[PDB]
Each structure stands twice: as structure tokens, then as C-alpha cells.
């Protein structure tokens, strides 16, 4: 029997199988408003008892660094998300909204009034990386503005309000994007965070921001509706730490403590496999070390296949396995994995284009 199709209780959510739609930015949410195309896309991939995580979603007007990504900070956005959540729920799926602030991984073109993006630091991403522009060219990451503690508290409140908005739209929960060199990771990683106040220096201080964000959303909507994504070891946007495993374990310790204090477990911890990039024994052991340390559900992501996902669940390395690129090109990926049916190729050229159909909803079913 296939271990990916054993049921799993993710808190109060009864999942029928362990194949998860990973969060993926696709840039079809024109003008940051969820569009009907998103409803068709998520409906195609929804299954009864299956778990879906949305594309990263803006928590505020300054949180974007990609074109046409959805927000959930306005009532117009909430109204349009509600239509998408309804069609997914009609298929029996569980769906979480990923809350995403890019921090310094932005550009004047994505910021109100062309202002500088915000970060923990004034250090820019280096010129080894270039940002996708709305016209399909690539631009230069600018120097960010380093925020003070008042502004940090405002950003935490943006997460809190967005979590409440997600519940209003009908989402089952939210995921905190704390990975991949974006705003939260710019506080976590000692290769970025050069602060001398209470949010920088020590490992404890670098973990303060993610702790406050998670506590804020747990207080607002309940721990069992909150997932947290991190990537202590990742090659993306100059987000390195001198001791990735200790960083990961410090975050896990904080999450365990939040659960004890709240008297409830989070929905899950979601960790990117260090092998995953946008453009091996030590890697696997880092994943298992974090899993063994965390008191709760563990989702693994990054480079998984049918065989590797089966291995992960069978060996106890993870409870759930999220798939990205193969879910782009296989709307019925869950069914194909169950049947061991051949998978369709994906076309990177249309990952981030705006067409509501081409490269988005026109990948065929079996
Ligand atoms: C087009 C694309 C967009 C992505 N956008 C996000 C995102 O918005 N938030 C996030 O946490 N991860 C994002 N990722 C990472 C995926 O969630 C996932 O971890 C990765 O695709 C899994 O590896 P796989 O593609 O080999 O399955 C993205 C990946 C792709 C390919
Ligand atoms: C390389 C890791 O970064 C990602 O996967 C991502 N978002 O988190 C995007 C928008 O591609």
C-alpha cells in the first residue's frame, strides 16, 4: 500500500492523503486582485481531503516584489478570494493562504511612490541576483530601508490583520512565509541581519521577529490554523547563515514554546529541502534533525518525486509532502501519484506570465 494515501489528522483537518499543493507565485492575480483564473487553477488541483497552500499573498501595499501577485489586505481582495475558496471547498479540499512579505527582495516599480523596500538591514541583495520586472526584463535589487521597532510592530500587525482577513474570506488557515530570503528570513539569517538593537546580534534576537509574527497570528486565529514555513539552509537571494542547523533548531524551540504557552499545536512546520533552487547526506540529516526536534506535523518540500515522497512518509521523515513544479503541469497530480501514471512536463517560460489560460489552466488531465 502507498503511504502517501494513508489518512492524516492535521489538527482538526482530516486529510485523506499526504500530497500537498506547495505555495507557488504564478502572477495571474492582475493588479493584486484574485481573478477568476485562480479559481479555475485551484479547482483543477483540489481533491477531496487534499490540502492546498496558495501562492504567496501580500499583507500590505509594501509587501510585493513580483507582478500581479494577490493581496489579502483590502476588502476587495477578501471578496474575490471568497469566490476562490468556495470552489475549492466544494471539491472537499482544505486550503491555507500563504502570507508573504518580500522585504528587500523588491524594486521601486513594486513599491508605493517608488519608495525603497524595507528590511532588517540597509544591505541589498547582491548583483548576482536580478529581479523579474513587470515587462519581463530583469532589474537591479535596490538598497532597502532598515526599519525601527515601531515599524516592526506595524508589520506584525499587518500579518495579524491579514490572517483575520483570510479567515473572513473562508480560508481554513494561513501559512507564514518565513523562508527563502524574504522579510522574515532577512531577520533570521546572520548573513543579512547586522542589527545592534533587540532584533539583531544574538541568535535569540534574530528569532524575535518570527516569534512575534507567529504569536500574533496564533492569538488572532488559533494555533491549529497557522502553519509556518522556513528554510534555514537555502541558496536564494543572499540569505545565508553561519550555522543553519542551530538557526533551524532555535526556530523550532520557539515554535514548541508557543504551542506549550497557547495550549495547542500549530497546523504544521513546512521546511524547504536545501537542494531546492529557483534558477546530500548533510541535507537529509538537517531535515530529519529539525523534524525530530519539532513537536508537531512536518511538511517537506523541494525536489520531491513520487518515489522520494513515498520514501519520506514511509521512513518517518515527514508527515506530508508538498509538490510544486509537477503540480503546475499535472492538475491531477494526486491521482497520477496514486495510479503511478506518467507525468506531464512543465514549461518554466510560463511560470510567471499573466495569461489566465496559457501555461496555467491548459495543462491536460489524464
Ligand atoms: C513557480 C514557483 C513559484 C513559487 N512560489 C513560492 C511562493 O510564493 N511561496 C513559497 O513559499 N514557495 C514558492 N515556491 C517554492 C514551492 O513552494 C516549492 O517548495 C517547490 O516548488 C517544491 O519543489 P518542486 O518544484 O521540486 O516540487 C515556488 C516555486 C515555483 C516553481
Ligand atoms: C528559491 C526559493 O524561492 C521560491 O521558491 C519563491 N518564493 O518563496 C519564488 C517566488 O520563486
Residue numbers in the entry: 9 to 287, 298 to 384
Please quote the authors directly.
The biocatalytic reduction of the oxime moiety to the corresponding amine group has only recently been found to be a promiscuous activity of ene-reductases transforming α-oximo β-keto esters. By studying the crystal structures of enzyme oxime complexes, analyzing molecular dynamics simulations, and investigating biocatalytic cascades and possible intermediates, we obtained evidence that the reaction proceeds via an imine intermediate and not via the hydroxylamine intermediate. To gain more insight into the reaction pathway, we determined the crystal structures of the two enzymes OPR3 and XenA in complex with the oxime substrates 1a–c, either by co-crystallization or by soaking. All the crystal structures obtained had a high resolution (1.9–1.35 Å) and showed clear electron density features for the oximes.
To assess if the introduced amino acid exchanges affected the overall structure and the binding of the oxime, we also crystallized the tyrosine variants in complex with selected oxime substrates. The protomers in the crystal structures of the tyrosine variants are perfectly superimposable with the ones of the wild-type enzymes, confirming that the exchanges did not lead to major structural alterations. Interestingly, the binding mode of the oxime substrates also did not change in most of the structures. The propanoyl moiety of oxime 1b points into this cavity and is likely stabilized by hydrophobic interactions. Substrates with an acetyl moiety (such as oximes 1a and 1c) give the non-productive binding mode described above. Interestingly, the exchange of the canonical tyrosine (Y190F) did not have an observable effect in this experiment, indicating that fast protonation in the active site is feasible, likely via a water molecule. On the other hand, the canonical tyrosine variant OPR3_Y190F showed a 2-fold increase in kred and an 8-fold decrease for the NADPH Kd. Though a parallel 2-fold increase in kox is also observed, the Kd for the oxime seems not to be affected by the mutation, indicating that the canonical tyrosine residue does not play a role in substrate binding in this enzyme.
